Write an enzyme that holds these catalytic residues in place. Structure first.
Site, PDB file in Angstrom:
ATOM      1  N   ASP A 128       0.837  -1.196   0.000  1.00  0.00           N
ATOM      2  CA  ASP A 128       0.000   0.000   0.000  1.00  0.00           C
ATOM      3  C   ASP A 128       0.874   1.249   0.000  1.00  0.00           C
ATOM      4  O   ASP A 128       0.563   2.245   0.662  1.00  0.00           O
ATOM      5  CB  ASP A 128      -0.962   0.014   1.191  1.00  0.00           C
ATOM      6  CG  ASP A 128      -2.041   1.079   1.062  1.00  0.00           C
ATOM      7  OD1 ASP A 128      -2.156   1.692  -0.022  1.00  0.00           O
ATOM      8  OD2 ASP A 128      -2.774   1.306   2.047  1.00  0.00           O
ATOM      9  N   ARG A 132       0.367   9.030   1.373  1.00  0.00           N
ATOM     10  CA  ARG A 132      -0.442   9.052   2.587  1.00  0.00           C
ATOM     11  C   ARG A 132       0.121   8.151   3.678  1.00  0.00           C
ATOM     12  O   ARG A 132      -0.178   8.367   4.859  1.00  0.00           O
ATOM     13  CB  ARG A 132      -1.878   8.633   2.265  1.00  0.00           C
ATOM     14  CG  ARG A 132      -1.990   7.216   1.725  1.00  0.00           C
ATOM     15  CD  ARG A 132      -3.420   6.851   1.364  1.00  0.00           C
ATOM     16  NE  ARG A 132      -3.489   5.536   0.737  1.00  0.00           N
ATOM     17  CZ  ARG A 132      -3.385   5.323  -0.568  1.00  0.00           C
ATOM     18  NH1 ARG A 132      -3.227   6.322  -1.420  1.00  0.00           N
ATOM     19  NH2 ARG A 132      -3.441   4.077  -1.029  1.00  0.00           N
ATOM     20  N   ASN A 133       0.923   7.151   3.317  1.00  0.00           N
ATOM     21  CA  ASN A 133       1.477   6.207   4.278  1.00  0.00           C
ATOM     22  C   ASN A 133       2.930   6.501   4.631  1.00  0.00           C
ATOM     23  O   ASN A 133       3.559   5.703   5.332  1.00  0.00           O
ATOM     24  CB  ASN A 133       1.342   4.777   3.748  1.00  0.00           C
ATOM     25  CG  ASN A 133      -0.089   4.276   3.786  1.00  0.00           C
ATOM     26  OD1 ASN A 133      -0.878   4.684   4.639  1.00  0.00           O
ATOM     27  ND2 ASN A 133      -0.432   3.388   2.862  1.00  0.00           N
ATOM     28  N   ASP A 146       3.412   1.745   7.785  1.00  0.00           N
ATOM     29  CA  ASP A 146       2.244   0.922   7.477  1.00  0.00           C
ATOM     30  C   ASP A 146       2.554  -0.180   6.470  1.00  0.00           C
ATOM     31  O   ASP A 146       1.650  -0.675   5.790  1.00  0.00           O
ATOM     32  CB  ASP A 146       1.078   1.780   6.973  1.00  0.00           C
ATOM     33  CG  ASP A 146       0.446   2.610   8.075  1.00  0.00           C
ATOM     34  OD1 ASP A 146       0.925   2.533   9.227  1.00  0.00           O
ATOM     35  OD2 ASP A 146      -0.532   3.335   7.791  1.00  0.00           O
TER      36      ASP A 146
HETATM   37  N1  LIG Z   1       4.545   8.272  14.040  1.00  0.00           N
HETATM   38  C1  LIG Z   1       3.745   9.460  13.747  1.00  0.00           C
HETATM   39  N2  LIG Z   1       4.223  10.664  14.027  1.00  0.00           N
HETATM   40  C2  LIG Z   1       3.462  11.729  13.746  1.00  0.00           C
HETATM   41  N3  LIG Z   1       2.235  11.761  13.198  1.00  0.00           N
HETATM   42  C3  LIG Z   1       1.790  10.535  12.932  1.00  0.00           C
HETATM   43  C4  LIG Z   1       2.488   9.323  13.176  1.00  0.00           C
HETATM   44  C5  LIG Z   1       1.561   8.288  12.711  1.00  0.00           C
HETATM   45  C6  LIG Z   1       1.797   6.758  12.726  1.00  0.00           C
HETATM   46  C7  LIG Z   1       2.089   6.102  13.911  1.00  0.00           C
HETATM   47  C8  LIG Z   1       2.301   4.719  13.917  1.00  0.00           C
HETATM   48  C9  LIG Z   1       2.217   3.988  12.718  1.00  0.00           C
HETATM   49  C10 LIG Z   1       2.442   2.461  12.674  1.00  0.00           C
HETATM   50  O1  LIG Z   1       1.911   1.760  13.473  1.00  0.00           O
HETATM   51  N4  LIG Z   1       3.313   1.928  11.617  1.00  0.00           N
HETATM   52  C11 LIG Z   1       3.605   0.496  11.450  1.00  0.00           C
HETATM   53  C12 LIG Z   1       3.407  -0.428  12.479  1.00  0.00           C
HETATM   54  C13 LIG Z   1       3.692  -1.748  12.272  1.00  0.00           C
HETATM   55  C14 LIG Z   1       3.477  -2.779  13.402  1.00  0.00           C
HETATM   56  C15 LIG Z   1       2.898  -4.220  13.342  1.00  0.00           C
HETATM   57  C16 LIG Z   1       4.298  -4.026  13.836  1.00  0.00           C
HETATM   58  C17 LIG Z   1       4.170  -2.164  11.065  1.00  0.00           C
HETATM   59  C18 LIG Z   1       4.367  -1.240  10.040  1.00  0.00           C
HETATM   60  N5  LIG Z   1       4.081   0.075  10.248  1.00  0.00           N
HETATM   61  C19 LIG Z   1       1.915   4.671  11.527  1.00  0.00           C
HETATM   62  C20 LIG Z   1       1.707   6.050  11.538  1.00  0.00           C
HETATM   63  N6  LIG Z   1       0.472   8.905  12.254  1.00  0.00           N
HETATM   64  N7  LIG Z   1       0.657  10.196  12.408  1.00  0.00           N
HETATM   65  C21 LIG Z   1      -0.365  11.170  12.003  1.00  0.00           C
HETATM   66  C22 LIG Z   1      -1.753  10.527  12.079  1.00  0.00           C
HETATM   67  C23 LIG Z   1      -2.880  11.472  11.564  1.00  0.00           C
HETATM   68  C24 LIG Z   1      -2.566  11.992  10.137  1.00  0.00           C
HETATM   69  N8  LIG Z   1      -1.185  12.479  10.065  1.00  0.00           N
HETATM   70  C25 LIG Z   1      -0.875  13.805   9.483  1.00  0.00           C
HETATM   71  O2  LIG Z   1       0.250  14.178   9.439  1.00  0.00           O
HETATM   72  C26 LIG Z   1      -1.981  14.732   8.933  1.00  0.00           C
HETATM   73  C27 LIG Z   1      -2.524  15.765   9.934  1.00  0.00           C
HETATM   74  C28 LIG Z   1      -1.607  16.215   8.787  1.00  0.00           C
HETATM   75  C29 LIG Z   1      -0.099  11.633  10.569  1.00  0.00           C
END
Ligand code: A1BI0
Length: 260
Positions: A128, A132-133, A146
């Protein structure tokens, strides 16, 4: 294992709502800045997700979002990662105030290509890949996130990720590293398009039909013939004719060095 004591976490601010639930900013053990993604109930096959998560926890690369631990002995599930200050790359591109330089755009493509070359080398499919990811830290470095989670999504016509899929996925769901290659090319298009929607004038189903017929995304204005040749090579009809992430990274390195 990778289990983290949820009682050692503090939620200081909700950063937004991402895939599989909400994301928080907080402190781990009152020492480390982290982001906690709370998996929304009923959004994933949790049992399968928890096991494969341990595998993904051992993946180590500078350009992959660093995974610290998980909280699976409770509900909702917690995923503890590093805090990417500048957030989602997609919203980062759509911020004209940053005034990206062409060299910076190519730097963002290399960051993502490094992580995918690593995943490719470990035979791990993202499945994916899209702006966005991807996430961005305070220093402006892009990291992949992700990876491999769409496998555990619970579905509750053609969907939106169609715009990042090659013909064999649209018609047969034949996911492979070569379908990550295709998606990476569209990712390069988003980057040099500053967050533009691919096939903006088309619906999901229409995009699928045009892809099956040989329609390709045009050359973005901020992209030179050299860069567009790289992203365009990810879009060969035959999956076996698309370059590997090794070759893609190699090509990107060559362009960057000439621009030095
Ligand atoms: N780390 C951040 N730091 C700052 N912001 C962050 C994050 C994240 C984040 C946190 C954790 C994960 C994860 O679990 N990855 C994973 C896990 C696994 C596990 C099975 C082993 C495997 C692979 N990938 C993925 C994204 N999301 N977000 C905002 C959310 C709302 C939208 N966002 C925006 O920016 C828009 C508002 C402008 C980003």
């Amino acid at each position: 294992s990778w289990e983290i004591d949820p009682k050692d976490l503090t939620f200081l601010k909700e950063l937004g709502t991402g895939q599989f639930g909400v994301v928080k900013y907080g402190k781990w053990r009152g020492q480390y800045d982290v982001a906690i993604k709370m998996i929304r109930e009923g959004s994933m096959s949790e049992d399968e997700f928890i096991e494969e998560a341990k595998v993904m926890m051992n993946l180590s690369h500078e350009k992959l979002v660093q995974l610290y631990g998980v909280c699976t002995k409770q509900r909702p599930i917690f995923i503890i990662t590093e805090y990417m200050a500048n957030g989602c790359l997609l919203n980062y591109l759509r911020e004209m105030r940053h005034r990206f330089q062409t060299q910076q755009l190519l730097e963002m493509c290399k960051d993502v290509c490094e992580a995918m070359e690593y995943l490719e080398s470990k035979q791990f499919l993202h499945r994916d890949l899209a702006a966005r990811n991807c996430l961005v830290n305070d220093q402006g470095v892009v990291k992949v996130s992700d990876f491999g989670l769409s496998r555990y999504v619970l579905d509750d016509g053609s969907k939106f990720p169609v715009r990042w899929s090659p013909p064999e996925v649209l018609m047969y769901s034949k996911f492979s590293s070569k379908s990550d290659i295709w998606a990476f090319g569209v990712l390069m298009w988003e980057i040099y398009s500053l967050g533009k929607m691919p096939y903006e004038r088309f619906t999901n189903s229409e995009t699928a039909e045009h892809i099956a017929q040989g329609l390709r995304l045009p050359r973005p204005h901020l992209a030179s013939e050299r860069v567009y040749t790289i992203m365009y090579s990810c879009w060969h009809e035959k999956a076996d004719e698309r370059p590997s992430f090794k070759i893609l990274l190699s090509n990107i390195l060559d362009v960057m060095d000439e621009e030095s």
